Structure 1
Amino acid sequence: AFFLFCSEYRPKIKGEHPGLSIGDVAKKLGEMWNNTAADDKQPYEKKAAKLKEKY
């Protein structure tokens, strides 16, 4: 569920910060998705499951 949350927060991260490296940005997004509650990634996980079922 954290993968779709990271994918959805990547544009927010690029808007809040200019971005220096994709690796550090991805690490920070993963750390944030792990520190936040699991309910925050529920619609993201639902959209990921929908995209997996459609493809």
Structure 2
Amino acid sequence: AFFLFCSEYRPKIKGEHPGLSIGDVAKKLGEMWNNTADDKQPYEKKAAKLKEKY
């Protein structure tokens, strides 16, 4: 949920207000994503689709 959600919301969250380091940026953003599945499922669905396609 949160992994695919961060890999999806990368553009705006990384080009609007990143933070101190890429580490802390993606950490806080993945936390917010996991605390949003209820609103991030299709990103994980696309991830699993690519995984099956591989």
Structure 1 length normalisation: TM-score? 0.79
- Runs (4+) of structure 1 exceeding 3 A deviation are none
Where does structure 1 lack aligned partners over 5 or more consecutive residues? Answer: none
Q: CA deviation at 1:18?
A: 4.9
The aligned residue for residue 5 of structure 2 is 5
Aligned length: 54
Q: CA deviation at 1:22?
A: 0.9
Alignment root-mean-square deviation, CA: 1.5
Structure 2 length normalisation: TM-score? 0.80
Higher helix share: 1
Where does structure 2 lack aligned partners over 5 or more consecutive residues? Answer: none
CA 1:45–1:31 in 2, change beyond 3 Å: closer, same or farther?
same
Identity over aligned pairs, percent: 100
The aligned residue for residue 54 of structure 1 is 53
Q: CA deviation at 1:19?
A: 4.7
Q: CA deviation at 1:35?
A: 1.7
Q: CA deviation at 1:20?
A: 3.8
